[PDB]
């Protein structure tokens, strides 16, 4: 009964010239996300929520851009290593929920694929992983298509 909650946030700029990768899914679009490696805003937010629930710090403390051990690691590899550390710290993951905020493109066709990737990386039943997606109603840098945000929540239990 030693439950803990975690929460996560990430945002990346959206400009022409890079692929759009969210939840491990490459999505055709005239723009993509800027950042180190694949810039997968959804997996980053979930990773931070899991480290947070385990009180293990954050994604930057575990996976430095300088560290050679993770030099060529994509965000799914980081999520799997996060899950390994959360387990070794004594915690079992109970569920993950999340939201992607992007004015475009439409993400609904890709939700099942993202959920499948996340559930595989976390070794969770599919019904314990949820991804939601919406626009920002044309408000702000998100509403103008200048970036994409992700939010995540995770529940774990100390075993």
């Amino acid at each position: 009964m030693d439950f803990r909650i975690g929460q996560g946030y990430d945002v990346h700029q959206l400009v022409p010239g890079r692929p759009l990768i969210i939840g491990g899914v490459t999505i055709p679009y005239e723009r993509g996300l800027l950042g180190h490696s694949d810039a997968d805003v959804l997996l980053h937010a979930i990773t931070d929520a899991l480290f947070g629930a385990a009180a293990l710090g954050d994604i930057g403390r575990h996976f430095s851009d300088t560290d050679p051990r993770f030099k060529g690691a994509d965000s799914r590899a980081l999520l799997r290593e996060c899950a390994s550390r959360v387990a070794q710290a004594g915690f079992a993951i109970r569920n993950v929920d999340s939201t992607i905020i992007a004015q475009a493109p439409k993400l609904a066709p890709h939700i099942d694929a993202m959920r499948a990737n996340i559930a595989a990386d976390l070794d969770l039943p599919l019904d314990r992983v949820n991804v939601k997606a919406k626009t920002n109603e044309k408000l702000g840098y998100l509403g103008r298509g200048e970036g994409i945000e992700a939010q995540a929540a995770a529940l774990v239990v100390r075993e």
Copy 2:
């Protein structure tokens, strides 16, 4: 002991010539929220948190903003149907918390009425529902009064 957490976010533009309906409360104001439904940003955020905790997707999956049957829809009726589907999936709701962020109007006089509406719609006592209200401290489109944001968290248990 099969607890799950969900999180929700929503934003809508503030425009002339629309009712301002937040938490089910019609608030006297010269502007209202723009949306396909009644645009109740707080109830939408809570709806998303509940679908998310149950791994049932999101509000756009269940109540599409392109379906004419939801034009002008009462978001309390949508929230009640969400709660019915969460129950049908096997979950009982344990608590909801939420935040509304707006430059104006003052929401303190209306918070208790919003809490009572949500509690009624979710078949919860008042002591399991919370609504918080604040400004965005003058920053961004929220500081400029261009829209209103809501955030929500929900805890459920699979019975």
Copy 3:
């Protein structure tokens, strides 16, 4: 008990000249500081609102008035301690807190551990039940331009 409850909090403060930068109780060298009551500690405000939310006690604005003589000179750690007292008064025990600070500058990583220790002391929690995370906003929006700093928090409590 098995009567768990979750709360969520959000706050943002403007960065202004002539004030110290205090986040999580830590004074951080910087040319600007946060605008608000006393030390304007945006992280402690977000945690405070998450704790009130988890206990269904409302929010900061309903608990802490500018006119209350008990709190006129109170800093954000005194208010966080008072929040925790009111959570306990309502019959709840805190199980864990997690949080994120979004600041484009300065670097917060050297200060995280001290923030965690401050929060744990104020909430009477062991360090392993308190977490603080730090992020930039990738140069987007008012956060990315350095006009303010945001904090987010989540709290789990149980009705004892």
